[PDB]
């Protein structure tokens, strides 16, 4: 939904999306080759599926080519200063890729506005959408936009023949929050099932070694183990085929 969206959001209204109760296979998109860069910050590109965060945040905005390099932890640059201010301890992976084949259009794509000028940089992840026309000089503008008075936003107009420094690179940056139980985790493999062999099993929670034989014990619809009169494991419900 977020990556393959048809309607991306402009950068002056840069987006955010809390995602919970998810199984997030980061690698099925890491091995996509449709990206310009998977520049993880805080963690590695792989070795995410073994992580369990509370929520992840999917920003969905588009920038130019060099503004990708602008996007990085604790940077100094127009977008990192007036549109999307990463904190320096940002835990995630910026995932940007050109869309000059997709979002560009003849004559230009004038639907994108970047925060042209404003008095000061933002807080981390501060979503500034206020369109208060720039105040400067010595007087408020009152809409006329006189000298030193300007609009805080500037249209892009993506021309399909613009260089890599001006081509649309739809960017989507993810963040990791840990507070509470973790509802988002990468998937877990599940091997084949071997019976009648002393194996070192590991069912979803519990471990141990034994010889798994097809039984006839009839658990209740919700149970997961069994136990013996001395509280030793005696049966396990196969979590793929019950």
């Amino acid at each position, epitope marked *: 939904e977020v990556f393959n969206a048809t309607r991306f959001a402009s950068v002056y209204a840069w987006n955010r999306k809390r995602i919970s109760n998810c199984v997030a296979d980061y690698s099925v998109l890491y091995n996509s080759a449709s990206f310009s860069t998977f520049k993880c910050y805080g963690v590695s590109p792989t070795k995410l599926n073994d992580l369990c965060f509370t929520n992840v945040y999917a920003d969905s905005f588009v920038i130019r080519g060099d503004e990708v390099r602008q996007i990085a932890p604790g940077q*100094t*640059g127009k977008i990192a200063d007036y549109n999307y201010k990463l904190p320096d301890d940002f835990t995630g992976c910026v995932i940007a890729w050109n869309s000059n084949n997709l979002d560009s259009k003849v004559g230009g794509n004038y639907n994108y506005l970047y925060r042209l*000028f404003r008095k*000061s940089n933002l807080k981390p992840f501060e979503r500034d959408i206020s369109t208060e026309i720039y105040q400067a000089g010595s007087t408020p503008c009152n809409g006329v936009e006189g*000298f*030193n008075c300007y609009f805080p936003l500037q249209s892009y107009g993506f*021309q399909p023949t613009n260089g890599v*420094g001006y081509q649309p690179y739809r960017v989507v940056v993810l963040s990791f929050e840990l507070l509470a139980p973790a509802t988002v985790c990468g998937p877990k493999k599940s091997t084949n099932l071997v019976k009648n062999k002393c194996v070192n099993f590991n069912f979803n929670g519990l471990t141990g070694t034994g010889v798994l034989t097809e039984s006839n014990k009839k658990f209740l619809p919700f149970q997961q183990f069994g136990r013996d009169i001395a509280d030793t494991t005696d049966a396990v419900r196969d979590p793929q085929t019950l």
Partner: antibody
Framework: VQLVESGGGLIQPGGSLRLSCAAS????????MSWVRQAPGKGLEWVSV???????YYADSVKGRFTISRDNSKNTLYLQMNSLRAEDTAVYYC????????????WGQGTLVTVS | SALTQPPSASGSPGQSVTISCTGT?????????VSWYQQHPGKAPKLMIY???KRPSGVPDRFSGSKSGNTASLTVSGLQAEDEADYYC???????????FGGGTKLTVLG
């Protein structure tokens, strides 16, 4: 837009000049500004910028040594330098503007600065 | 890399003269914005044509040359006795906010 620079001179390696461009006509706070210089008989040489969020940039020969600053209000505007060599003689001029977008249209009066 | 040009381009008074502005496609064929410059000897660096389809507020009309892909060119029409000066160029690099300029086009109008 009455901007009047002040502070040029001639400096041996080690000194530091602090220019002072008055910002009477145009706020430098909650605004932007750029510093430039021109070698006699040459196109311009961008030497410094100051964004609204205090961001700063310098060109090759001046990054790491050139240090621009200014007071909180629209009083003044500086350009400090360090480790001067014989290569840096060029007439100075102030350039109202910031980067390519929002071009340089308004300018200063020009202070003759010579480094050798 | 820099907007290097032939520093001397001449022509007859009243007719037109082309003042070029040449750099690499990393910038000149990338952005929407290129700005032109000119200086009468001693005058402050005066921009000529920013946002090539645009000019400043009251600056006269016989300016506004264009950008022919990888190479720009200023087309001054109606050369009058006040059209003798030095010309320059200006635009932005593709790195670290770097703003570029021209090598210095001394517009030598025949006297």
């Amino acid at each position: 837009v009455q901007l009047v620079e002040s502070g040029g001179g001639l400096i041996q390696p080690g000194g530091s000049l602090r220019l002072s461009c008055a910002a009477s006509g145009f706020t430098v706070s909650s605004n932007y500004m750029s510093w430039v210089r021109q070698a006699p008989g040459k196109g311009l040489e961008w030497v410094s910028v100051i964004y609204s969020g205090g961001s700063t940039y310098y060109a090759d020969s001046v990054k790491g040594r050139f240090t621009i600053s200014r007071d909180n209000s629209k009083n003044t505007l500086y350009l400090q330098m360090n480790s001067l060599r014989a290569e840096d003689t060029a007439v100075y001029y102030c350039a109202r503007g910031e980067g390519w977008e929002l071009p340089y249209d308004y300018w200063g009066q020009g202070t003759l600065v010579t480094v050798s | 890399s820099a907007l290097t040009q032939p520093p001397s381009a001449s022509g007859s008074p009243g007719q037109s003269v082309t003042i070029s502005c040449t750099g690499t496609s990393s910038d000149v064929g990338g952005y929407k914005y290129v700005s032109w410059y000119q200086q009468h000897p001693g005058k402050a660096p005066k921009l000529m044509i920013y946002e090539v389809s645009k000019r400043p507020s009251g600056v006269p009309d016989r300016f506004s040359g264009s950008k022919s892909g990888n190479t720009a060119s200023l087309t001054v029409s109606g050369l009058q006795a006040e059209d003798e000066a030095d010309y320059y160029c200006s635009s932005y690099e593709g790195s670290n906010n770097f703003v570029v300029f021209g090598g210095g086009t001394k517009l030598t109008v025949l006297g």
